[PDB]
């Protein structure tokens, strides 16, 4: 419990003001009002984080404020990915020094690197991370790097390596992973797939989403414990009906505003180049946050 | 069942040293298939190799498995080509032979707008003369990228009666059952048949039925029960088999393994197909041995 | 004589009850011999072969025989996804005297390299001599070849020849480099004057049927070292893909071969829609400019 | 004027990975001295995804006033973030470039809207200096169609365009529809093709150790001399063929350093060493181009 890793966690958002800085009273409200909602914990600096639209001080920053928020509190994870190895090792070592119970980093991108870079990289960050285990980060969507079952399984079986957040839509290879590797902590990284992704092998995830609904997961991990499949498949269904909409409206975006019309967030906006959510999307936005408020 | 939902074997074409149709084997498949309990057979599809054999030889096994079944088992007829008039021709055939439904993969090799995807199954479901149609989605092996848009635009085409969704996306596979809660779903992808139920699908269609399919039936029972574990334990099992399959390669790897169950008399696939590795009978006459101990 | 030059991708004419048009496919043969062609690909992708049965395939191959036999160069695609189908077409190919036969790498299920070498050998033993001419069109096949695989099949006993559908033209430079001696077509007309910079000596494609000349045109203007004609001549053939791109190639094609009497009914077959009425007046005229163009 | 051959500048780093200053003086005064028409820096060749803002700012300072008024400058300030960009525009802009340069933002998706108004954003800091869109779906993972090049194109401020893209059907569609547009080929393999389809010049990693070859084929072509052509191409292929084995950024950078230009040949992490079975060939390239010219 003191060490596990496993379990529901929000990919938390970084909260913005009206000039793309930082909000600060509105991440410490997040932050919160995650802890509030049960969730097992707080992926930081992940790309629900904007982490690749912040400099290393932003990102620092973040974490540093999040810790002081939750440590103690939930579990955290701190994304410490950059392309760059040594900027990577720089946040692995805040991580540390700010009481993180672990560190996180995507494949690098852009670049093409082999596979024996790709195992170098996460070498170097695991030594800076100085005892906080890993979490190998897949998501070749975004990535662009598409990595083998071997492959894989090198990466997760490497000194230090305690988790794989696997965001990955093919059950074969989360079912295959789980077969090779028993007590790996498999995170489930489409949040409108969860539920398969649970029964494939995964033991619990990480999602954007989480942030106005991770009761909803929760009670699905719940669920296809007791048997009840049912229950299962009725909130997958509601998440995936949410996650249409955010599909449209944008993501990150549309998560935030959902989030400031639950009082959470100040400001709802992203990042440029990320645009505004377009006016149209509103009605159904509210009426959104009005019936997670009631249900909630 | 009054209905096409259920777990059906994708049937494979046994040949004979001389690559030609072995009826006596393919006879036995069928009964094989019957006998494990399965719903009902998928004929004349990619596991049955049709795909390299003439419109004569996909119409004679037709026949073949009608005399052999119809009237206990459902039976489905794939007569897709990336011809109209020869999948049009393959329709009216099924439709003689007593077949429950006919089904169409996505023609391909050619570039076909969405348009002339839907004249296609309209033209195929014309010819079935009232057999309904079961739409074949495989965007791995057909190179045909359909949206959900264009899914559901063809799955409500009038005659439409089921999709196999041939297809590891199982968010799309939510949101096709959530756009049609009566259509009957068939899960394509043997290794995700458990989470693919869970996602939506009511039912499937596979190669590895044919050696195993009381396992996807168990797994079929156990979600039903709301046994989480039993469904688990059953899906990897599939899976272990799976992925010797996928080694020794799939069809071929059946088929031998057919061969060692006293089933099919000469287990290979026609070229361009290679035989199965030397290697790797050991482990598949192991298997055969212990599905056969298993029943 | 040798196999390198420009070959048009033969049509399959066909009539309104989509059977074949054997007065319209005689005409078009004879008609690209006039254009001065120097050969044709028969029983392709643009032949809509993949639409038609094994018997239907031999019948154009044996009519396309008895009109240019002897007068161009002849190559018979025999590629099926079988590897039996294929051959018995080769074992035409060579009964009917084409100058070669040609496969497309066998598609939809998923082959080992080293089967998809043994469907070669297996065909080019079934053509009884007549020399291969590998086909590798990843776009439509799905098959991927690296270089070392593509070097592989150019080097098998039989083959003589590589039809490169490939808008890869570092792959072209290098094939050419590793093999000085390939007969390498061109396969996307788009890039034909590219195509042959990079190391293509000919080219094999759907366009040649109404403006064959043009191609030569590029072939003699960057012999001749002439790069602003080469362009020229390149840049009028993308303006007419442009558009048969949004009509559809094999249909626009047949379309304008039909405005200038060759073709008399100018209809692929299904799923093969129609010509959008909406470009028949574009087609016309294409087909009025290439009429007094040549 | 814009049109021409630029090498795509690498950032030289010392043993500890910083910036080696005194070898990135040296590398832009090699490219002057080989005939350069210009350089194109804080590329992914200047492994500029691998630095910080300062870093790449530092980079740009030190090459304007090692080359400003003798060469082109273009300086490529893309980011994913848009302010970021934005920086790194208003930078160039204070040392004195000719132009900047981004990108298509990437990792996130974004509308195509999204990219418009990006560029937009950098033109409107990059205060008058000319835009030269940056085209490389292999990398960025962005897909774009005919169409929305061509509005890209066209903005107000937009300049050139760096096409990385082995399309040559698109490269001359692109020409076609702009008969006046500065378009560079972006991969150096293909370099002779490129122009013949359409493209007016080039932007290339490896024309840091032989550009004077492009601007062979530039010449050769204009003459009519399509056998030259041919022949250049080959050569510059054979050793882009071994800098792909490689690994090309290092085996230039090592090539560099057997030319005495650069002091230490390495990448920054998660770049590794050039596997030592390739320095024979890697010495005997460097040797062959120093004889050669
Ligand atoms: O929407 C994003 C993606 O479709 C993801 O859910 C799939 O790739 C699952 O395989
Ligand atoms: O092996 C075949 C495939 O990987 C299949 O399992 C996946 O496509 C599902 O995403
Ligand atoms: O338009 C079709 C294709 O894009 C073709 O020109 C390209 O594949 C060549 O690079
Ligand atoms: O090697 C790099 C790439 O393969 C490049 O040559 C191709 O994308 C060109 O079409």
């Avoid at 760059?84 to 540390?96: I, N, R």
Wanted: with cysteine; glycine share 8%; aromatic share 8%.
């Amino acid at each position: 419990m003191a060490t596990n890793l496993r379990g529901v966690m929000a990919a938390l958002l970084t909260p913005f003001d009206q000039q793309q800085a930082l909000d600060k009273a509105s991440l410490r409200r997040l932050v919160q009002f995650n802890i509030q909602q049960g969730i097992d914990g707080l992926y930081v600096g992940g790309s629900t984080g904007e982490a690749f639209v912040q400099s290393l001080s932003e990102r620092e920053q973040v974490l540093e404020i999040v810790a002081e928020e939750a440590k103690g509190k939930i579990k955290l994870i701190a994304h410490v990915g950059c392309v760059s190895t040594a900027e990577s090792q720089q946040l692995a070592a805040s991580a540390k020094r700010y009481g993180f119970d672990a560190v996180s980093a995507v494949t690098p991108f852009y670049y093409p690197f082999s596979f024996e870079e790709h195992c170098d990289h996460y070498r170097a960050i695991i030594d800076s991370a100085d005892g906080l285990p890993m979490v190998v980060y897949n998501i070749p969507a975004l990535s662009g790097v598409k990595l083998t079952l071997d492959q894989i399984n090198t990466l997760v079986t490497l000194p230090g390596v305690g988790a794989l957040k696997q965001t990955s839509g093919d059950l074969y290879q989360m079912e295959q992973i789980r077969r090779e590797h028993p007590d790996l902590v498999l995170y489930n990284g489409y949040d409108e797939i969860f539920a398969s992704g649970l029964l494939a092998g995964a033991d619990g995830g990480i999602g954007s989403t989480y942030n106005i609904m991770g009761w909803r997961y929760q009670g699905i991990v719940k669920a296809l414990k007791e048997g009840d499949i049912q229950t299962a498949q009725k909130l997958q269904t509601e998440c995936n009906k949410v996650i249409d909409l955010l599909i449209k409206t944008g993501v990150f975006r549309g998560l935030k505003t959902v989030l400031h019309y639950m009082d959470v967030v100040s400001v709802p906006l992203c990042r440029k180049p990320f645009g505004p959510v377009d006016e149209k999307y509103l009605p159904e936005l509210k009426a959104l946050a009005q019936q997670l408020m009631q249900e909630r």
